[PDB]
Symmetry: C2
Subunit: 144 residues, 2 copies
Amino acid sequence: MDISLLKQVVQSTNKIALSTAVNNEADVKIVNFVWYEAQPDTLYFSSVKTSPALKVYDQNPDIAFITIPNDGTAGNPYLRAQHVKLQRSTKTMTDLLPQYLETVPNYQQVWDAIGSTLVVFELKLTDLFVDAGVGGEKQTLTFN
Amino acid sequence: MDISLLKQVVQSTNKIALSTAVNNEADVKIVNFVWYEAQPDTLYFSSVKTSPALKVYDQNPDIAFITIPNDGTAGNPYLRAQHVKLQRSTKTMTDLLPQYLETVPNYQQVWDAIGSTLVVFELKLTDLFVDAGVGGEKQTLTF
C-alpha cells in the first residue's frame, strides 16, 4: 500500500495529543512519538514507569490521537486516528533512542535524567486520516 | 478572582486539543477557540453544523482539553482542564468573529467559505490549570 502521503506528513511532527476514555473519563496528554517506514501502522512512545498515565496505558485501552506540527512548520499538516490499539512494545528505548535523538529536540538530557525508568508502548493503527495541509493532499489509509 | 495569569497564557494560543469520552470511546481533534475576560469560565469554539462531531457533542460527552502554543512561543505555556461541560451557545459566530480575526491567522477565508454553516459551542470550566511555562507560575483556578 502506498504510504507516500503518510511519509510526507510524519516528517514534520514528533508529537501527538493522545486521548483516552477509560471509565468514560476524557483525558488528553501530549507525548513524543517515533515512527519507522518498515512498520508504517505503528507509532511508538514511552512513559515513566511510576507515572499515573502509564497506569491507564497498561489497561491496553483503545485510544485516539492527532499529531501537532513541529515549530516552524506552517500549512497545518496532521495525522488523526481513533480506535488505536495500545499495548506494551517488544522494542526497548535502546532500540528507539537513535530515532528519538534525531527527531526530538534536547532528548539527550531527558534520556540521561530518567531513561532507565521509561517503558515503551506501541500504538497500532487500523484507519488513519492523513492531511498534508496547505497545498497538499488528503486521504485515509486502512492497515491490515 | 485574579485572572491575570490566565489572560497572559491564553494570549499565546488560539487552539485546543479537544478530547471526548462517550461510551468509553475516545476522540480528539484540534479546534480554534476564543476567550473573553468578561466571561472567564468559558471557551468558545465552532463546528460546521453537518459535522459528525455534533453527534458526539449531543451525547453529553466527558471533555478534557489542553491548549497548543502559537508557533514561536517560548517555554511551553498551556491551559489544561478535565470534566469540562459542553453546551450550545446563544452567541453566534458574528459575535465571535472579531476575536477569531484578531487571533487566528487567515480565518477570513474560512469565514468567507463556510461561515453561515458554523454552530457555536461553549466549554464551561470547573477547575482550570494554568501553566505559564519554564520559570513561570502554575495555578489552578476554580470557577
